[PDB]
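Example record

The entry below shows one chain as it appears in the dataset: sequence first, then structure tokens.
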Amino acid sequence: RVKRVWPLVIRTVIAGYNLYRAIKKK
């Protein structure tokens, strides 16, 4: 598998829909 593709791209989707939405959905 890949080790690092998008450094900032993902950080946006993750920091915008994976920082609270994802966490809370543990």
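Notes for this example: Helices lie at 9-17, 21-24. DSSP finds two helices and no strands in the chain.
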